[PDB]
Structures are given as C-alpha cells and as structure tokens.
Amino acid sequence: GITGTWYNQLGSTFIVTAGADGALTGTYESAVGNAESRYVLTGRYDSAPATDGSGTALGWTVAWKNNYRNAHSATTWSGQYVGGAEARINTQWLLTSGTTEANAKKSTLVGHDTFTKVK
Amino acid sequence: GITGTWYNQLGSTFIVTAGADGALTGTYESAVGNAESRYVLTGRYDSAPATDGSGTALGWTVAWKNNYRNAHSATTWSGQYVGGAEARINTQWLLTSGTTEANAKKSTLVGHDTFTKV
Amino acid sequence: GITGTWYNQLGSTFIVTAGADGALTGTYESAVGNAESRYVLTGRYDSAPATDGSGTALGWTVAWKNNYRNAHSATTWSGQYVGGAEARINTQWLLTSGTTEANAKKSTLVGHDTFTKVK
Amino acid sequence: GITGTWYNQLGSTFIVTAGADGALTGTYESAVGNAESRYVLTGRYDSAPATDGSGTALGWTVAWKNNYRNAHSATTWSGQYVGGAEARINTQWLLTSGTTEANAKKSTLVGHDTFTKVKP
Numbered sequence: 102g103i104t105g106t107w108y109n110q111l112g113s114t115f116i117v118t119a120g121a122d123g124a125l126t127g128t129y130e131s132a133v134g135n136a137e138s139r140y141v142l143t144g145r146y147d148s149a150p151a152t153d154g155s156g157t158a159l160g161w162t163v164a165w166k167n168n169y170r171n172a173h174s175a176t177t178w179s180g181q182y183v184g185g186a187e188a189r190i191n192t193q194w195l196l197t198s199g200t201t202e203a204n205a206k207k208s209t210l211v212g213h214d215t216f217t218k219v220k
Numbered sequence: 221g222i223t224g225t226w227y228n229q230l231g232s233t234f235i236v237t238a239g240a241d242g243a244l245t246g247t248y249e250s251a252v253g254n255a256e257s258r259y260v261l262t263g264r265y266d267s268a269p270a271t272d273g274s275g276t277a278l279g280w281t282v283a284w285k286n287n288y289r290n291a292h293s294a295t296t297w298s299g300q301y302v303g304g305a306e307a308r309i310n311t312q313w314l315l316t317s318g319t320t321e322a323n324a325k326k327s328t329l330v331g332h333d334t335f336t337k338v
Numbered sequence: 339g340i341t342g343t344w345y346n347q348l349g350s351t352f353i354v355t356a357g358a359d360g361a362l363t364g365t366y367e368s369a370v371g372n373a374e375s376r377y378v379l380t381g382r383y384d385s386a387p388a389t390d391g392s393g394t395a396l397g398w399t400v401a402w403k404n405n406y407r408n409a410h411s412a413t414t415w416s417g418q419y420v421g422g423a424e425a426r427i428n429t430q431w432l433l434t435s436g437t438t439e440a441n442a443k444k445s446t447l448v449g450h451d452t453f454t455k456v457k
Numbered sequence: 458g459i460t461g462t463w464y465n466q467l468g469s470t471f472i473v474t475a476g477a478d479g480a481l482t483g484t485y486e487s488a489v490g491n492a493e494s495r496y497v498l499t500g501r502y503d504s505a506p507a508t509d510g511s512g513t514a515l516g517w518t519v520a521w522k523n524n525y526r527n528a529h530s531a532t533t534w535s536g537q538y539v540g541g542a543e544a545r546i547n548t549q550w551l552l553t554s555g556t557t558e559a560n561a562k563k564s565t566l567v568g569h570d571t572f573t574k575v576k577p
C-alpha cells in the first residue's frame with residue numbers, strides 16, 4: 102500500500118517504492134522552497150506492522166542536491182502510513198540547513214505534511 | 221569525514237558510510253528503548269557542501285525492526301556534520317510509533333543527539 | 339483579535355485574553371489525554387505585529403495539574419495568529435512529561451493544532 | 458528549587474520565580490539572535506511533581522518584544538527541572554516568527570537548551 106505516488110497539502114509529489122525488506126527508495130519534488138525538479142530520497146519502514154489497527158511507522162530523507170541545484174540542506178520526514186479507502190501518510194518533518202556556529206539557532210525548521218493518494 | 225563509527229551521548233553506536241553521490245548507509249545500535257543489537261539505516265547528505273565554514277546537512281532513518289525484535293516504530297535524525305579538531309554530527313530526531321488514529325498525539329517523540337567518534 | 343474562545347481539530351477549548359501588555363491568560367480544556375476540566379494557561383504574544391500581512395507570533399503553556407488531577411506534564415504551543423475572514427491560530431506544540439533519567443527518550447511529544455472560533 | 462537564575466549553553470540568562478500556585482514569571486535575556494536586554498516571560502510548572510525520581514514538567518514563553526526592540530517572534534520552551542547535585546532544566550524549544558502564508562515553511566525553528574545554575 103505504500104508504493105506509489107503521493108501528494109501533500111503543499112502540492113509536492115512523493116514517488117516511493119517500499120522494498121520487501123524495509124527499504125524506501127524514490128524521488129521527491131517540492132512545490133515550495135529552494136528546489137527544482139526531482140531529488141533522491143531514501144528511507145525505511147516497518148515491513149511487518151502490527152495487525153492490530155495501527156499505522157505503519159516509517160521515515161525518509163531528502164538531501165536537497167540534484168543535477169540542477171544545491172540548497173545545502175536536508176529534510177527528514179517521520180510518520181506513519183494508514184491504509185484503507187482513504188490512505189494517508191501523516192508526517193512531521195525537520196529541515197536542517199548547513200550553518201556556521203554563529204547561526205546554529207537557525208539551522209532546523211519543523212513542520213508537518215499529510216500525504217494522500219489524491220491531487 | 222562522515223564515514224566512520226560514531227557514538228552519541230547515550231552510548232548508542234552509529235556506523236556509517238557516506239557514498240560519493242550523497243548516500244548514507246550503515247547500522248545503528250541504540251543504548252536505550254525497545255531495541256537490541258543492530259538495525260539497518262539509510263539516509264542522504266550534501267555531497268558538495270558550502271566552503272564558508274558551514275556544516276554539512278544530512279539525515280537518516282532507522283525502522284526499529286531487525287531479526288530479533290520489532291518495536292513498530294522509526295526514527296529520523298536531521299542535522300549537520302561539522303569537521304575540524306573535534307568533528308561531530310549535531311542532530312534533532314523524531315521517533316514515530318505506529319498508532320491508532322485516536323492515539324496520534326502520542327505518536328511522535330522529539331529529541332536531540334550529538335555524535336562524536338570518541 | 340486573539341481574545342476569545344477557540345477550538346482545535348480535536349475539540350479542545352482554548353479560552354484566552356490577550357492583554358495590551360503582550361500577555362495571554364486564560365484556561366484550556368483538552369478533549370483528549372490525561373486531563374479533565376479546565377487548566378490555567380499563560381503565554382505571550384507580539385502586541386506590535388508587522389503590517390505587511392504577516393501573522394502575529396505567540397505562545398502559551400499549560401501545566402496539566404488542576405484541582406482534580408495531575409498528569410505531571412506540561413504542553414507549550416508555539417505559533418501565529420492569522421487574522422482576516424476566517425481567523426485562526428496555527429500552532430506546533432511540545433508536550434513534556436516529568437520523567438526519570440531512564441525514560442528520557444519518552445519525555446517530549448511533538449504535534450500540531452489548528453484553532454478557529456468555530457464550533 | 459526552580460526559582461532563581463539559570464544559564465543555558467549559549468550563555469543566555471533565565472531569571473525566574475516559581476509561584477506556590479504553578480506560576481512561572483521572570484525575565485529572559487538571550488545571548489544570541491534578534492534580541493537585546495531582558496524580555497518578559499510567563500509560564501507554568503507542575504507544583505506537585507511525582508516524588509519518585511521524575512523531573513518537574515514545565516514550560517514558558519517569551520514574545521521577543523520589549524522596550525529596545527521587536528523581532529516579531531516568540532519562543533516557547535518545554536521541558537523539566539531536575540534537582541540534586543547538579544540541578545538542570547532540560548528543554549526543547551520552538552521559535553515561531555510571524556510570516557505570510559507563503560513563507561509558512563520557514564515559520565518555526567526547533568532546538569534545545571540545557572540550563573544550569575552555573576554559567577557556561
């Protein structure tokens with residue numbers, strides 16, 4: 102249920118493949134920020150989730166460097182997949198930018214993204 | 221550089237290899253929590269970082285399932301590598317557990333880990 | 339403005355008064371968790387926000403102890419007030435529980451709440 | 458245990474009074490960022506913690522406006538006070554800057570501060 106294309110509330114596109122082993126691989130295209138086109142993403146997910154009515158834990162990372170540009174930053178998403186007729190991946194994220202010591206307070210932004218199979 | 225064996229303030233062990241094209245692969249062993257032995261990790265890092273003294277951005281994930289146990293959770297670490305005399309990786313992490321929709325509020329813990337090669 | 343009765347997506351009720359001095363005072367009643375009835379809250383907000391369309395920064399805290407129960411925990415909400423037709427307060431929160439050294443990992447939960455005066 | 462002067466690893470100064478009623482009141486002076494001098498802070502803490510080794514839950518907010526300047530931002534610290542030999546207040550914080558809807562992703566920074574009774 103995780104493999105496929107996902108869309109978040111910002112208009113971004115998350116293309117992922119969930120491996121039989123627990124591997125998450127794919128590309129991410131952000132609708133906002135210092136980003137253009139697709140970026141590599143890699144992550145992990147619980148490949149044997151509880152069959153007791155709970156989501157499937159997972160996470161992935163995107164370093165914002167590709168053949169077109171480098172934002173010198175990286176974002177990690179942490180959350181869970183919930184299946185069904187209204188599938189969704191609910192996440193909280195941390196976007197860290199490389200900084201000088203003097204600027205360490207500005208290194209990490211926090212937010213949340215909800216992904217659905219629609220849009 | 222990033223490639224090597226690191227330890228955080230809890231005594232956890234982070235063994236990682238930084239690929240030339242931005243990949244991070246390795247193993248993680250936590251000193252605390254619902255975990256035992258090593259777990260697979262994968263991530264990404266800026267392989268062409270700025271040269272103005274700024275750290276190198278990076279991140280990685282561990283899903284807490286291995287051959288011995290499964291905690292039905294996953295942690296992501298977001299941070300940066302800083303070289304020099306006392307090289308370190310400063311991170312903030314999010315640990316999400318699979319939950320019911322009703323328990324979503326208890327789903328994600330937040331913290332911070334600092335790693336050094338010592 | 340900020341003064342008023344707000345509700346978030348969980349059904350919790352946030353009753354607040356924004357003082358001319360930048361203070362936030364009021365009560366909070368959570369629809370979920372280890373809580374019952376009203377709890378005291380206090381916080382601060384920018385009483386001279388920018389005039390370029392930016393939101394008004396604010397934050398408040400609730401320690402989860404009142405005359406009826408004590409959860410040995412406290413939550414802080416950080417966010418901004420957005421005026422206009424549909425006024426809203428968008429927040430990210432941290433819920434810290436008192437813990438022993440051994441349970442440090444479980445000390446702080448992070449989430450997000452959106453409030454409106456509707457309900 | 459809580460009332461008094463605290464310093465974080467950045468050298469910021471947190472002077473607070475914990476009321477018998479759960480109130481936290483005081484001043485905060487940041488060593489970094491768009492700030493100068495002292496700012497008003499208000500917060501709350503558990504006035505009857507578990508006497509079992511557990512810390513004392515608490516939190517406070519500073520809106521970064523005072524008589525000298527206004528950064529149009531506010532920080533909330535969430536954490537717990539731990540007494541004993543080496544007393545500390547361990548916290549995680551969220552700093553939200555007022556932004557337009559278009560700059561939402563850049564609205565909230567996250568970090569951590571460890572406060573001690575002895576300057577860094």
Ligand SMILES: O=C(O)CCCC[C@@H]1SC[C@@H]2NC(=O)N[C@@H]21
Binds near residue numbers: 113172175
């Ligand atoms: O600006 C940058 O440093 C690189 C792009 C960051 C895009 C962020 S990642 C968190 C959020 N979710 C998205 O889909 N886009 C933004």
Ligand SMILES: O=C(O)CCCC[C@@H]1SC[C@@H]2NC(=O)N[C@@H]21
Binds near residue numbers: 250251443
């Ligand atoms: O309890 C669990 O669900 C799985 C183990 C979590 C270990 C956490 S990950 C964040 C922190 N850093 C560590 O090295 N260990 C803990």
Ligand SMILES: O=C(O)CCCC[C@@H]1SC[C@@H]2NC(=O)N[C@@H]21
Binds near residue numbers: 369370435
């Ligand atoms: O369980 C507890 O420790 C005390 C109650 C916490 C209720 C949380 S605070 C963050 C979120 N928003 C709400 O309105 N309720 C929950």
Ligand SMILES: O=C(O)CCCC[C@@H]1SC[C@@H]2NC(=O)N[C@@H]21
Binds near residue numbers: 467491
């Ligand atoms: O730059 C600003 O918007 C206002 C000042 C922010 C100072 C931050 S609050 C979190 C961290 N802890 C400190 O003591 N100082 C910085």
